[PDB]
Structures are given as C-alpha cells and as structure tokens.
Coordinates of C-alpha atoms and ligand atoms in Angstrom, one line a residue:
Chain A
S1 CA 38.7 -11.3 17.1
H2 CA 36.1 -14.2 16.9
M3 CA 33.0 -12.0 16.4
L4 CA 32.7 -10.7 12.9
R5 CA 32.9 -13.3 10.0
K6 CA 35.8 -12.0 7.8
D7 CA 34.6 -14.2 4.9
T8 CA 31.2 -12.8 4.2
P9 CA 30.7 -11.6 0.6
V10 CA 29.2 -8.2 -0.1
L11 CA 26.6 -6.6 -2.4
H12 CA 28.0 -3.7 -4.4
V13 CA 25.3 -1.2 -5.3
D14 CA 26.2 1.1 -8.2
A15 CA 22.7 2.5 -8.2
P16 CA 22.2 6.2 -7.3
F17 CA 25.5 6.0 -5.4
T18 CA 28.1 3.5 -4.3
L19 CA 26.8 1.3 -1.5
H20 CA 28.0 -2.0 -0.1
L21 CA 25.7 -4.5 1.8
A22 CA 26.5 -7.5 3.8
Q23 CA 24.4 -9.9 6.0
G24 CA 25.4 -12.6 8.5
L25 CA 28.5 -10.8 9.9
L26 CA 27.3 -12.0 13.3
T27 CA 25.2 -14.9 14.3
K28 CA 21.7 -14.3 15.6
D29 CA 22.9 -15.6 19.0
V30 CA 25.7 -13.0 19.2
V31 CA 23.4 -10.2 18.1
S32 CA 20.9 -11.2 20.8
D33 CA 23.8 -11.3 23.3
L34 CA 24.9 -7.8 22.2
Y35 CA 21.4 -6.4 22.2
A36 CA 20.5 -7.8 25.7
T37 CA 23.8 -6.3 27.1
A38 CA 23.7 -3.1 25.0
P39 CA 25.0 0.0 26.9
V40 CA 22.1 2.1 25.7
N41 CA 21.9 4.1 29.0
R42 CA 25.4 5.5 28.1
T43 CA 24.0 7.4 25.1
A44 CA 23.3 11.1 25.1
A45 CA 20.2 12.6 23.4
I46 CA 20.9 14.8 20.4
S47 CA 18.6 16.5 17.9
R48 CA 18.4 19.2 15.2
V49 CA 15.0 20.4 14.1
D50 CA 15.1 23.5 11.8
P51 CA 15.8 24.3 8.2
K52 CA 20.3 17.3 8.0
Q53 CA 17.7 17.2 10.7
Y54 CA 17.7 14.4 13.2
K55 CA 16.7 13.1 16.7
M56 CA 18.7 10.3 18.3
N57 CA 20.9 9.0 21.1
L58 CA 24.6 8.6 20.8
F59 CA 27.9 7.9 22.5
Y60 CA 31.3 7.0 21.1
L61 CA 33.3 3.9 22.0
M62 CA 36.3 5.3 20.0
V63 CA 37.3 8.7 18.7
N64 CA 40.4 9.1 16.5
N65 CA 41.6 5.5 17.0
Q66 CA 41.5 5.9 20.8
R67 CA 39.1 4.1 23.1
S68 CA 36.9 6.5 25.1
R69 CA 36.1 6.5 28.8
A70 CA 32.6 5.2 27.9
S71 CA 34.3 2.1 26.3
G72 CA 35.4 0.9 29.7
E73 CA 33.4 -1.4 32.1
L74 CA 31.7 -3.1 29.1
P75 CA 30.2 -6.6 29.0
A76 CA 32.6 -9.2 27.7
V77 CA 30.7 -9.5 24.4
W78 CA 30.9 -5.8 23.8
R79 CA 34.6 -5.8 24.7
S80 CA 35.1 -8.4 22.0
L81 CA 33.0 -6.5 19.4
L82 CA 35.0 -3.3 20.0
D83 CA 38.3 -5.2 19.8
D84 CA 37.1 -6.8 16.5
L85 CA 35.7 -3.6 14.9
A86 CA 38.9 -1.7 15.8
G87 CA 41.2 -4.6 14.8
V88 CA 43.3 -5.0 11.7
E89 CA 41.4 -8.2 10.6
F90 CA 38.1 -6.3 10.3
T91 CA 39.7 -3.3 8.6
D92 CA 41.1 -5.8 6.1
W93 CA 37.7 -7.2 5.4
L94 CA 36.0 -3.7 5.1
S95 CA 38.9 -2.4 3.0
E96 CA 38.7 -5.4 0.6
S97 CA 34.9 -5.2 0.6
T98 CA 34.4 -1.5 -0.3
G99 CA 37.5 -1.2 -2.5
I100 CA 38.8 1.7 -0.3
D101 CA 41.8 1.0 1.9
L102 CA 41.1 2.3 5.4
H103 CA 44.3 1.4 7.3
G104 CA 46.0 4.7 8.0
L105 CA 42.8 6.6 8.8
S106 CA 41.2 8.2 11.9
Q107 CA 38.5 5.7 13.0
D108 CA 35.4 6.7 15.0
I109 CA 33.2 4.0 16.6
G110 CA 29.8 5.1 18.1
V111 CA 26.8 3.4 19.4
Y112 CA 23.5 4.8 18.2
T113 CA 19.9 4.1 19.4
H114 CA 16.7 5.3 17.8
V115 CA 13.5 5.1 19.9
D116 CA 9.9 5.9 19.0
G117 CA 9.9 9.3 17.3
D118 CA 13.6 9.3 16.4
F119 CA 14.7 9.8 12.8
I120 CA 17.4 11.1 10.4
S121 CA 16.2 13.3 7.6
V122 CA 17.5 13.2 4.0
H123 CA 21.1 14.3 3.8
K124 CA 24.6 13.5 2.5
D125 CA 27.5 12.9 4.8
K126 CA 30.5 15.2 5.1
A127 CA 33.0 14.7 2.3
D128 CA 36.1 14.6 4.5
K129 CA 35.9 10.9 5.4
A130 CA 36.5 7.7 3.4
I131 CA 33.7 5.4 4.6
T132 CA 30.7 5.2 6.9
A133 CA 29.6 1.7 8.0
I134 CA 26.5 0.8 9.9
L135 CA 26.3 -2.4 11.9
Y136 CA 22.7 -3.4 12.8
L137 CA 22.3 -5.2 16.2
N138 CA 18.5 -5.7 16.5
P139 CA 17.7 -9.4 16.7
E140 CA 14.3 -8.7 15.2
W141 CA 12.9 -5.5 13.6
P142 CA 9.1 -5.2 13.2
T143 CA 7.9 -4.7 9.7
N144 CA 5.9 -1.5 10.0
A145 CA 7.8 0.4 12.6
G146 CA 10.0 2.6 10.5
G147 CA 13.6 2.9 11.4
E148 CA 14.7 1.9 7.9
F149 CA 17.8 3.0 6.0
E150 CA 16.5 5.1 3.1
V151 CA 18.3 5.3 -0.2
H152 CA 17.3 8.7 -1.7
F153 CA 17.7 9.9 -5.3
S154 CA 18.0 13.6 -4.7
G155 CA 18.5 16.1 -1.9
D156 CA 15.0 17.7 -2.2
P157 CA 13.3 17.1 1.2
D158 CA 10.0 17.1 -0.7
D159 CA 11.1 14.1 -2.9
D160 CA 9.5 10.8 -1.9
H161 CA 11.4 8.5 -4.3
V162 CA 12.9 6.1 -1.7
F163 CA 14.3 2.6 -1.5
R164 CA 14.3 1.3 2.0
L165 CA 16.2 -1.4 3.8
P166 CA 15.2 -2.6 7.2
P167 CA 17.6 -3.5 10.0
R168 CA 18.7 -7.1 10.1
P169 CA 20.8 -8.9 12.8
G170 CA 24.4 -8.7 11.9
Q171 CA 23.8 -6.6 8.8
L172 CA 26.3 -4.0 7.6
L173 CA 25.8 -1.1 5.2
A174 CA 28.9 0.8 4.0
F175 CA 29.2 3.7 1.6
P176 CA 31.6 6.6 0.9
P177 CA 30.2 10.2 0.9
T178 CA 29.7 10.9 -2.8
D179 CA 27.9 13.9 -4.2
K180 CA 24.9 11.6 -4.7
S181 CA 25.0 9.8 -1.4
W182 CA 21.6 10.9 -0.3
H183 CA 20.3 8.8 2.6
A184 CA 18.0 9.0 5.6
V185 CA 16.5 6.9 8.5
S186 CA 12.7 6.8 8.5
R187 CA 11.1 7.8 11.8
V188 CA 10.8 4.9 14.2
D189 CA 7.0 4.4 14.7
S190 CA 6.5 1.4 16.9
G191 CA 4.4 2.1 20.0
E192 CA 5.7 -1.2 21.5
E193 CA 8.7 0.4 23.2
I194 CA 11.4 -0.9 20.8
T195 CA 15.0 0.3 20.4
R196 CA 16.9 0.5 17.1
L197 CA 20.5 -0.4 17.9
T198 CA 23.3 0.4 15.6
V199 CA 27.1 0.8 15.7
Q200 CA 28.5 3.3 13.2
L201 CA 32.1 3.2 12.0
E202 CA 33.5 6.4 10.5
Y203 CA 37.0 6.6 8.9
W204 CA 38.2 10.2 8.7
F205 CA 41.2 11.5 6.8
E206 CA 42.6 14.0 9.4
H207 CA 43.5 12.6 12.8
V208 CA 41.8 15.0 15.2
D209 CA 40.0 14.4 18.6
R210 CA 36.7 15.7 17.3
Chain B
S1 CA -2.6 1.9 -17.5
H2 CA -3.1 3.6 -14.1
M3 CA -1.6 0.9 -11.9
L4 CA 2.2 0.8 -12.1
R5 CA 4.1 4.1 -11.4
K6 CA 6.2 4.6 -14.5
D7 CA 8.4 7.2 -12.8
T8 CA 9.9 5.1 -9.9
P9 CA 13.8 5.0 -9.9
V10 CA 15.6 1.8 -9.7
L11 CA 18.6 0.3 -7.7
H12 CA 21.2 -1.2 -10.0
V13 CA 23.1 -3.9 -8.2
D14 CA 26.5 -4.8 -9.9
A15 CA 27.3 -7.2 -7.0
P16 CA 27.6 -10.9 -7.8
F17 CA 25.4 -10.3 -10.8
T18 CA 23.3 -7.6 -12.5
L19 CA 20.2 -7.0 -10.4
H20 CA 17.6 -4.1 -10.5
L21 CA 15.4 -3.3 -7.6
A22 CA 12.4 -0.9 -7.2
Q23 CA 9.9 -0.2 -4.5
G24 CA 6.6 1.7 -4.6
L25 CA 5.5 0.6 -8.0
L26 CA 2.0 0.1 -6.5
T27 CA 0.4 1.8 -3.5
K28 CA -0.3 -0.2 -0.4
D29 CA -4.0 0.2 -1.2
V30 CA -3.7 -1.3 -4.7
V31 CA -1.5 -4.2 -3.4
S32 CA -4.1 -4.9 -0.7
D33 CA -6.8 -4.8 -3.4
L34 CA -4.8 -7.2 -5.6
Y35 CA -4.0 -9.6 -2.8
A36 CA -7.6 -9.8 -1.5
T37 CA -8.9 -10.5 -5.0
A38 CA -5.9 -12.7 -6.0
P39 CA -6.9 -15.7 -8.2
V40 CA -4.8 -18.1 -6.2
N41 CA -7.2 -21.0 -6.7
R42 CA -6.3 -20.8 -10.4
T43 CA -2.8 -22.0 -9.7
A44 CA -1.5 -25.6 -10.3
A45 CA 0.9 -27.3 -7.9
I46 CA 4.3 -28.1 -9.3
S47 CA 7.5 -29.5 -7.6
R48 CA 10.9 -31.0 -8.4
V49 CA 12.6 -32.8 -5.5
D50 CA 15.7 -34.8 -6.6
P51 CA 19.3 -34.1 -7.6
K52 CA 16.8 -26.4 -9.6
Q53 CA 14.5 -28.0 -7.0
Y54 CA 11.3 -26.3 -6.1
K55 CA 7.8 -26.6 -4.7
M56 CA 5.2 -24.0 -5.7
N57 CA 1.9 -23.1 -7.3
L58 CA 1.6 -21.4 -10.7
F59 CA -0.6 -20.4 -13.6
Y60 CA 0.0 -18.1 -16.6
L61 CA -2.0 -15.0 -17.4
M62 CA 0.0 -14.7 -20.6
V63 CA 2.2 -16.9 -22.8
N64 CA 4.0 -15.6 -25.8
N65 CA 2.3 -12.2 -25.8
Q66 CA -1.1 -13.9 -25.8
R67 CA -3.6 -13.8 -22.9
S68 CA -4.5 -17.2 -21.6
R69 CA -7.9 -18.7 -20.8
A70 CA -7.0 -18.3 -17.1
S71 CA -6.7 -14.6 -17.7
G72 CA -10.4 -14.2 -18.3
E73 CA -13.1 -13.6 -15.7
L74 CA -10.7 -11.6 -13.6
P75 CA -11.5 -8.9 -11.0
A76 CA -11.3 -5.4 -12.4
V77 CA -8.1 -4.6 -10.5
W78 CA -6.4 -7.7 -11.9
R79 CA -7.6 -6.9 -15.4
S80 CA -6.0 -3.5 -15.0
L81 CA -2.7 -4.9 -13.7
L82 CA -2.5 -7.4 -16.6
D83 CA -3.2 -4.6 -19.1
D84 CA -0.5 -2.5 -17.5
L85 CA 2.1 -5.2 -17.2
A86 CA 1.5 -6.2 -20.9
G87 CA 1.4 -2.6 -22.1
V88 CA 3.9 -0.6 -23.9
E89 CA 4.2 2.0 -21.1
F90 CA 5.5 -0.6 -18.6
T91 CA 7.8 -2.3 -21.1
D92 CA 9.2 1.2 -21.7
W93 CA 9.8 1.7 -17.9
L94 CA 11.3 -1.8 -17.5
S95 CA 13.5 -1.4 -20.7
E96 CA 14.8 1.9 -19.5
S97 CA 15.3 0.6 -15.9
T98 CA 17.3 -2.5 -16.7
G99 CA 19.2 -1.1 -19.8
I100 CA 17.9 -4.0 -22.0
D101 CA 15.2 -3.1 -24.6
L102 CA 12.4 -5.7 -24.3
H103 CA 9.9 -4.6 -27.0
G104 CA 10.1 -7.2 -29.7
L105 CA 10.3 -10.1 -27.3
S106 CA 8.0 -13.0 -26.3
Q107 CA 6.5 -12.1 -22.9
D108 CA 5.2 -14.5 -20.3
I109 CA 3.2 -13.4 -17.3
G110 CA 2.5 -15.9 -14.5
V111 CA 1.0 -15.7 -11.0
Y112 CA 3.0 -17.6 -8.4
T113 CA 2.1 -18.5 -4.8
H114 CA 4.3 -20.0 -2.2
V115 CA 2.6 -21.5 0.9
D116 CA 4.1 -23.1 4.1
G117 CA 6.7 -25.6 2.9
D118 CA 7.2 -24.0 -0.5
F119 CA 10.6 -23.0 -1.8
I120 CA 13.0 -22.6 -4.7
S121 CA 16.5 -24.0 -4.4
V122 CA 19.7 -22.3 -5.6
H123 CA 19.8 -22.1 -9.4
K124 CA 20.4 -19.9 -12.4
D125 CA 17.7 -19.2 -14.9
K126 CA 17.8 -20.4 -18.5
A127 CA 20.1 -18.3 -20.7
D128 CA 17.5 -18.0 -23.6
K129 CA 15.6 -15.0 -22.1
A130 CA 16.4 -11.3 -21.7
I131 CA 14.9 -10.5 -18.3
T132 CA 13.0 -12.0 -15.4
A133 CA 11.0 -9.6 -13.3
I134 CA 9.2 -10.4 -10.0
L135 CA 6.4 -8.2 -8.7
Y136 CA 5.6 -8.7 -5.0
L137 CA 2.0 -8.4 -4.0
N138 CA 1.9 -9.2 -0.3
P139 CA 0.7 -6.2 1.7
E140 CA 2.7 -7.4 4.7
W141 CA 5.3 -10.2 5.0
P142 CA 6.2 -11.5 8.4
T143 CA 9.8 -11.1 9.4
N144 CA 10.8 -14.7 10.3
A145 CA 8.6 -16.7 7.8
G146 CA 11.1 -17.3 5.0
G147 CA 9.9 -16.7 1.5
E148 CA 12.8 -14.3 0.8
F149 CA 14.6 -13.7 -2.5
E150 CA 18.1 -15.1 -1.9
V151 CA 21.1 -13.6 -3.7
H152 CA 23.7 -16.4 -3.9
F153 CA 27.4 -16.2 -4.7
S154 CA 27.9 -19.7 -6.2
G155 CA 26.1 -22.7 -7.5
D156 CA 27.2 -25.0 -4.7
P157 CA 24.0 -26.1 -2.9
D158 CA 26.1 -26.5 0.3
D159 CA 27.2 -22.9 0.2
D160 CA 25.4 -20.7 2.7
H161 CA 26.7 -17.3 1.7
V162 CA 23.4 -15.5 1.0
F163 CA 22.0 -12.0 0.9
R164 CA 18.2 -12.0 1.4
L165 CA 15.5 -9.6 0.4
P166 CA 12.0 -9.9 1.9
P167 CA 8.8 -9.3 -0.2
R168 CA 7.5 -5.8 0.0
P169 CA 4.2 -4.5 -1.4
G170 CA 4.7 -3.2 -4.9
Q171 CA 8.3 -4.2 -5.0
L172 CA 10.0 -5.4 -8.2
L173 CA 13.2 -7.3 -8.7
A174 CA 14.6 -7.8 -12.2
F175 CA 17.8 -9.4 -13.5
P176 CA 19.0 -11.0 -16.7
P177 CA 20.2 -14.7 -16.6
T178 CA 24.0 -14.3 -16.4
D179 CA 26.5 -17.0 -15.7
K180 CA 26.6 -15.7 -12.1
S181 CA 22.9 -15.1 -11.6
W182 CA 22.5 -17.6 -8.7
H183 CA 19.3 -17.0 -6.8
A184 CA 16.7 -18.9 -4.7
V185 CA 13.6 -18.4 -2.5
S186 CA 14.0 -19.5 1.1
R187 CA 11.4 -22.0 2.3
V188 CA 8.2 -20.3 3.6
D189 CA 8.0 -21.2 7.3
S190 CA 5.0 -19.4 8.8
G191 CA 2.6 -21.7 10.4
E192 CA 0.0 -18.8 10.4
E193 CA -1.4 -19.9 7.0
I194 CA 0.1 -17.1 4.9
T195 CA 0.4 -17.0 1.1
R196 CA 3.4 -15.5 -0.8
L197 CA 2.0 -13.8 -3.9
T198 CA 4.1 -12.8 -6.8
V199 CA 3.8 -12.1 -10.5
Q200 CA 6.8 -13.1 -12.7
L201 CA 7.4 -11.5 -16.1
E202 CA 9.7 -13.4 -18.4
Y203 CA 10.9 -12.0 -21.8
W204 CA 12.0 -14.7 -24.1
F205 CA 13.9 -14.4 -27.4
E206 CA 12.0 -17.0 -29.5
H207 CA 8.3 -16.6 -29.9
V208 CA 6.9 -20.1 -29.0
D209 CA 3.8 -21.1 -27.2
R210 CA 5.7 -22.9 -24.5
Ligands
LIG301 FE1 24.6 10.0 7.7
LIG302 FE1 14.4 -18.4 -11.2

C-alpha cells in the first residue's frame, strides 16, 4: 500500500550473526498515528519464568497467511499497515533486503507490547522459519528505560557482552535464525507508564495454523 | 591502562561500507568522570560553509604519535584515557577488532565537541589513512537533539537515505575510508545547552606533523 517506503536501503550486519537494519520505513506522522490508535487492549499477557524466559503482551493480526478475528474492526491506519505488511510489494522489499526470498512462505503477523517490567531473555529463535522482522512503532523512546534489542555474542545467560539498539519510529530489524542468532530485549524500566509497541513478522516454512 | 575494556566484542557492518561498532568500552561512571572533567575550553572553533562542510570545536591531544602541548596539565582520568588510547594494548584491541593492523602507523588523537548548531555534512574521509575511530563520551544523549552519526548511501547532498546512530557512553565506531564510506553528523538541535563530546583516533600512513 502507501504505508511502508519500499525504497529504503538496509544495513547488513555480518557481525555475530546476519542482521538487517532499516530506518524511515514510516514517517513520524504515520508512526504517531499508528501508536495513538494502537489496539493494545487486544493483546494477551504471556510469560515464562523458570530455567527463553519472557514477559509480554501479544495478539496475532495474521496466522499462516490468514487474517485473524482480532484483525477486524481496526482503525483505518492499522488496516492499511496490515494490508501493506501482508502485501506482495513489502514481501518484495523484505526479500530483496535480506537476500532470502519469502514469497511462498507461511507468514505470521503479531502485535507485541512491552510495559514496565516486561522483557525477553537471551535466546535464539526456532530454526524452522526463514526470517523474523520487528517493526518499531514508538514515536519516541526514552533513553534510559530499557526495552532495547540486545545483540548477544553467546547463549550463556551470565554473559553481559551486549550491543543494544533502541526502538526508533519506523525502524525495522530482520534476521534469520542462525546458530549464532543470540538476542534479547532488555527489561523495560520506565516508571512513566510507557508502552513499547512492535509488530513482528515471522515467515515459516510449513503452512500450519499454529 | 585500566580504562578501556580490551575484551569487548565488536559489530562488523558490511552494509554500504565496512563499519565496526562497540559498546561498553568504558563504564558509565568513567564516562561521567571524563565528561565532567572534559577539557572542552581547550578546543578551537572551526567551520567550512560553502560548496565536506562542517562547524565544530577541536584540539589535538596527539599528532603523529607525539603528545601535544594541549595534552599536558590534564585531569588524572584524562591522563589515563590518553595513555590507554595511545598504548599498545588498545592498538591491539582495535587492530584485532577491525581486521587492519595499526601498529606502525602515525596516530592522531583529537577531542571534538559539537554544540547547538554544530554539524558535519555528508562526506567521505581522505583515503590516506587506515582507520578512523570515534569514542563517545556523553553520559546521556537526548533523543531528539541531533548529533547522530549518519550512515549515508551516496555522496549526493540532496539524498536523504540515512541510518543514524546516537552517541552512547563508552561507544566506539571505527571504519576505514572506502570509496563508499559516506557519513555525516546531524546538526545538534538541543536548546538545553548540551555538548556532544567525542575523541577521534586517526591512523595515518605517512608520519608527518600535520
Ligand atoms: Fe526472538
Ligand atoms: Fe569524517
């Protein structure tokens, strides 16, 4: 559609693992529009806390290339973003950007929110999918509130060698699940009642209604 | 010395040009110590504004492996940072991190500050040096104040395809001057009287007192 800029160049990161980064996919005005109309009350709370640990809120706009019940009755701007993210034009851009062609795959689109106390511990995604892409929809993220994408250099949960990237409006991070794809989300520590808004796009190999 | 952590891993960026990124070289306590004692009043104002344009403040702690007059009478923490940045242990780390060996080269160390209105336009460094490394010494950089390292995808000054990285305490960016090494520093736009503090390390091939 008209939302995502299909001409934005990407940063290829060969560093501990393949990682692709883009900024400016959406204007600040559109991200503000999406954030103010965000269907955050449609999320469900999930958490795992015992020896990938996490605590977050989630609901799926699309599972296995099929729009969900929760994807109906959306604000116009969210209807447009879902159309664009599910469309062929964006899959073109993301397939050209990451070097993996994603066209015949089972696509999942979910809306994630992280509030104060939410986190995702160090882990590596499941190997049975081609690409995970994270779209950041916060107009402004405070600088000492956590909620940062963490590039890790090992799976040892005691390791503190980290490279962090804060959310930015219209930013997209995309990476395939490689043996080295260790990543995490630092605990959101704001106190000023802020909400970390993302949309994750998963491209699976088998077409199941998971 | 005891300042810079010689065991921090690096992010290799193969994207539009070779770029290496590291965080946590210094603790937040040391960066705060360096910033509060920063010899910013030893800088000189420089600027070029006509068709690499810039506006900034600068003075050199070291030119051609030789400590300058301005490098004397420094606070103890700045004496230690200069010793560490000029030492063999750090040149080891930076040579291993970037893949270029920097030992027999002519090293320049300068202290740069950018205030409100300061900037560096899109350009590509001179080809007669091996590596430029930028050490960021702001304890906290506000999120909408400019002063960001800009990864550009062409030399056209009308091009607005950019990937930006904000300053972080103890962060280091390092890259060789390749044909594609287009970069810039967005104009500092704070209004709250803030100072962008960096230390640049240049490794030249010829040993001249430039
Ligand atoms: Fe994950
Ligand atoms: Fe430069």
